[PDB]
């Protein structure tokens, strides 16, 4: 398909334009550079395109090449780690006044019963695969002054949790939250998966 | 002079996933043209430079896995860091003693090892991110005995400034010493060896 290769074109120049940007690139390379993005122009009138639109598309097939890699030398694996917790938020000493604790999804639920009108934000460190949740690795719940108040911690002891383990989880922890006029937020990177 | 090469090797990775791409039938004829000229360039390139392909294609990689990561204009950002994981949960997380304590901070590292343990074959496992093909950020690393007993540990400090690759194969040159003296005999996994060192 034309189209196709026009989109994986736009993107590919765009990636030499960053790296002629980083100034690096020689003579000649900034001269095929300036060829293509020629070229490209009135491909892109011929096939009534939009380039930034094409640029976009060829960016998402570039994308799916480099997660199927085969290739020894070049795959990467792949799996990611998100953070939101800082080290120092993760290990951190907590206690509850009124602990609740509930097993669920091969996951631990706590929270304290005592705390009261708090806005509280949920911060995830945990894995991704695929654009969604792999394994969750700890999740705390933090009030505006970075208390913390809850935590969902995954049980190993037995089998493996879902995302979808984990989303019920989470919102059976705002729940219990809310009870207390909480205002219970949640991350953005646990927004998407 | 270098940026010329610098220039050469985003050609010959960039050709790599154009040529991905045409394996996949996707690629009209003009684009193939082009696969196939480019090629040929790219050719006479590494004979006149001096310089070999399957390696400009992977020292290119990581430079457009720069480009990618730094990518401004989310819709167009691709993430380069990777998760490796050795241990299962239950190895990472279990909870583990050391009858003789022997324990070392190195710059947001700590050190630590059961001096109690001798003439054993050990194991380290490590789940960690990886960039770049370089090791970016060790979340754990565990020492472990044939029947799967911890018995030492490189572990992040949480207070302190970042550590580098650097600093963590460091640490685990300074372990496998100590476990070594113990007259234990150290293997390292494929992931750190591959990695870490």
């Given amino acids: 398909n034309t189209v196709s290769s026009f989109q994986v074109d736009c993107f590919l120049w765009h990636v030499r334009k960053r790296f002629a940007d ?47 890699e085969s290739d020894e030398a070049l795959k990467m694996p792949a799996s990611r780690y998100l953070t939101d917790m800082t080290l120092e938020e993760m290990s951190r000493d907590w206690f509850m006044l009124m602990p ?20 509280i934000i949920l911060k995830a ?24 108040v809850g935590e969902i911690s995954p049980l190993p ?16 922890l705002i729940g219990g939250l809310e009870w207390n006029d909480n205002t219970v937020r949640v991350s953005e990177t646990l927004q998407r998966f």
């Fill in 22 to 68: 980083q100034e690096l690139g020689d003579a000649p390379f900034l001269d095929r550079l300036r060829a293509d993005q020629a070229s490209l122009r009135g491909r892109g009138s011929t096939l009534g395109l939009d380039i930034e639109t094409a640029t976009r598309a060829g960016k998402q097939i570039v994308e799916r090449i480099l997660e199927e």
């Fill in 100 to 119: 609740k604790q509930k097993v669920a999804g091969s996951l631990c639920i706590r929270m304290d019963q005592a705390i009261m009108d708090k806005n």
């Fill in 125 to 148: 460190n945990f894995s991704v695969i695929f654009d969604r949740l792999e394994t969750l690795i700890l999740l705390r719940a933090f009030t505006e002054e970075g208390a913390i």
């Fill in 157 to 172: 002891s037995l089998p493996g949790h879902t995302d979808e383990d984990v989303k019920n989880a989470i919102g059976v």
